[PDB]
């Protein structure tokens, strides 16, 4: 009952994966497709 599907969700968003989100990535979540 922990962090597992919000985990796969937070990694599925992340580009190269040191572990964090930045203001430059966040627009590309609300846009990128292809």
């Amino acid at each position: 009952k922990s962090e597992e599907e919000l985990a796969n969700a937070f990694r599925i968003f992340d580009k190269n994966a040191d572990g964090y989100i930045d203001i430059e990535e966040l627009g590309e979540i609300l846009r990128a497709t292809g």
């Binding site: 919000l6 964090y20 203001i23 966040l26 627009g27």
Partner: protein, 34 residues
Amino acid sequence: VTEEDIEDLMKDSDKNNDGRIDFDEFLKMMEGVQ
């Protein structure tokens, strides 16, 4: 409709001005509405 609107939403939903986000911030940026 451009990245200044995206810039005001990360600055609206943030408070302490950690202009980079960790997985904490993720849990409340999703559902930290009361």
